[PDB]
Amino acid sequence: PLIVPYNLPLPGGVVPRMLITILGTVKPNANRIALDFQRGNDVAFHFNPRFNENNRRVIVCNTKLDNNWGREERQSVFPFESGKPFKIQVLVEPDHFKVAVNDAHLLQYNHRVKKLNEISKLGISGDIDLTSASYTMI
Numbered sequence: 001p002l003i004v005p006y007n008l009p010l011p012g013g014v015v016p017r018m019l020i021t022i023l024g025t026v027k028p029n030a031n032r033i034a035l036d037f038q039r040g041n042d043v044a045f046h047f048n049p050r051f052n053e054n055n056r057r058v059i060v061c062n063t064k065l066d067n068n069w070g071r072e073e074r075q076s077v078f079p080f081e082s083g084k085p086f087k088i089q090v091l092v093e094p095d096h097f098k099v100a101v102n103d104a105h106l107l108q109y110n111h112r113v114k115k116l117n118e119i120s121k122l123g124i125s126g127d128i129d130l131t132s133a134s135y136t137m138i
């Protein structure tokens with residue numbers, strides 16, 4: 001295991017065809033997970049599984065600019081289960097981040113932050129046991 005929160009450097013930011021893989025286990029009584037792809041203090045892509053928002057499980061995605069959250073993009077398709085080993089894969093494409101969980105496509109999120117080569121950190125936080133975080137080019 002690795003201790004959460006964890007910062008994964010993304011040197012020289014991201015680029016199309018870069019695949020970022022996060023492996024871990026969801027804690028048994030999990031409430032929340034967050035991935036924060038950051039450009040300095042801005043959050044280009046915040047991917048936020050919520051296990052109990054008004055008794056529903058939802059994925060919330062957004063962008064934070066100058067410390068202000070933007071318009072939320074939401075998904076009720078919710079592939080995580082408490083207590084289980086997961087894999088989140090974020091593939092950077094030219095116009096969006098594409099997310100698959102456990103080898104099943106989940107969602108796309110259009111790039112709001114345009115300076116891909118400045119999105120130089122992935123913060124990983126919340127109710128997980130983190131096994132590894134890495135990247136490759138496809």
Ligand SMILES: CO[C@@H]1[C@@H](n2cc(-c3ccc(Cl)c(F)c3F)nn2)[C@@H](O)[C@@H](CO)O[C@@H]1Cc1cn([C@H]2CCOC[C@@H]2F)nn1
Nearest residue numbers: 032033034046048060061062063069070071072125126127
């Ligand atoms: C409660 O904070 C979350 C944010 N958040 C969540 C976390 C976090 C912290 C720690 C761990 Cl361990 C962890 F998993 C985490 F998710 N930190 N900040 C974030 O999820 C944003 C995503 O939009 O929503 C909330 C904040 C929020 C949303 N809105 C509006 C935006 C326009 O639409 C209507 C909304 F009201 N204004 N503020």
